Amino acid sequence: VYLDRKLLTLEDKELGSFGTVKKGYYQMKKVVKTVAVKILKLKDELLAEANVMQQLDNPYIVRMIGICEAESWMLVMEMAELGPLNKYLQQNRHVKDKNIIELVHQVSMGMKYLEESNFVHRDLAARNVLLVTQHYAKISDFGLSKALRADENYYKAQTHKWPVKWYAPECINYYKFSSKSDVWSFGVLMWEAFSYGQKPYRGMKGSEVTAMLEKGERMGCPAGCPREMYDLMNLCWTYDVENRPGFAAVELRLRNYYYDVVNHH
Ligand SMILES: CNC(=O)c1nn(C)c2ccc(Nc3nccc(-n4cc(N[C@@H]5CCNC5)c(C)n4)n3)cc12
């Protein structure tokens, strides 16, 4: 878990600026590993974030190499070279619809695993999906993540920063976070991906988003997004937690549509 700082080389320039994200290199048993490092420069939160990641083992989740306590607290992770999914899509507007399905399906596989492992992500958004390649997505940013209690299906937040546009109505109304509330967030993530990284509920206040959802209104279908994918987004946005599908059902719908699109092309 605790890394040797002598074996870590950080780059001067930062990838993003909580703290900062920097590129580095970790001298391993034989090969040198390119890493992305979360630098605090909050400590308990970074250690809790590292503890969650240490427990996760899935191809569609960012792997943590370890933690290092130096001039600042550091979270060292395997590098996903292409960066955040939203920024990638904003910069590469010609990514094909089939490719977008492939990527959101990968996110759904990672989330199906998280749900099976009884962890709630609580910040599932396109800015928190990183690309290894144009055809390989991983989920990152476990800072708000919680291991569910053995006797409960949800995490109850004691007191209300929250990305409200990604949050299910029960998160807002009852401060209850479950895998079903991550399904809601995943619906918003699908909308962002098919909208090529555009922000959801454009120009609206958090209170206006709450009022809109309460009226039963939902975001429209993004340009070029297939009806089947929009139908899935709307299903993720099922107001009532009990009637909302879980990730096993969401991943299966995506898997089947993806292979239908693959074999049609
Ligand atoms: C803010 N800008 C960036 O992160 C970023 N910009 N560019 C150009 C990048 C290129 C590669 C990677 N590669 C990577 N590979 C593995 C892990 C990470 N991580 C990033 C976060 N936080 C960022 C804050 C919210 N979501 C992401 C965490 C926790 N891990 N990044 C990240 C970035």
UniProtKB/Swiss-Prot annotation:
The modification Phosphotyrosine is found at Y2, Y113, Y136, Y154, Y155, Y174, Y257, Y258, Y259. It is found in: Cell membrane; Cytoplasm, Cytosol. The modification Phosphothreonine is found at T20, T159, T210. One of its GO terms (biological process) is positive regulation of interleukin-6 production. GO terms for cellular component: B cell receptor complex; cytoplasm; cytosol; early phagosome; nucleus; plasma membrane; protein-containing complex; T cell receptor complex. The modification Phosphoserine is found at S17, S207. Keywords: Adaptive immunity, Angiogenesis, ATP-binding, Cell membrane, Cytoplasm, Disease variant, Host-virus interaction, Immunity, Innate immunity, Kinase, Membrane, Nucleotide-binding, Phosphoprotein, Repeat, SH2 domain, Transferase, Tyrosine-protein kinase, Ubl conjugation. The active site is at D123 (proton acceptor). GO terms for molecular function: ATP binding; integrin binding; interleukin-15 receptor binding; kinase activity; non-membrane spanning protein tyrosine kinase activity; phosphatase binding; phospholipase binding; phosphotyrosine residue binding. It comes from the Eukaryota. ATP binds at L15, G16, S17, F18, G19, T20, V21, K38. It is linked to Immunodeficiency 82 with systemic inflammation: An autosomal dominant immunologic disorder with onset in early childhood. It is characterized by recurrent infections with various organisms, and multi-organ inflammation that manifests as colitis, hepatitis, arthritis and dermatitis. Patients have a propensity for the development of lymphoma, usually in adulthood. Disease severity is variable. The SH2 domains mediate the interaction of SYK with the phosphorylated ITAM domains of transmembrane proteins. Some proteins like CLEC1B have a partial ITAM domain (also called hemITAM) containing a single YxxL motif. The interaction with SYK requires CLEC1B homodimerization. Belongs to the protein kinase superfamily. Tyr protein kinase family. SYK/ZAP-70 subfamily. This is Tyrosine-protein kinase SYK. The gene is SYK.
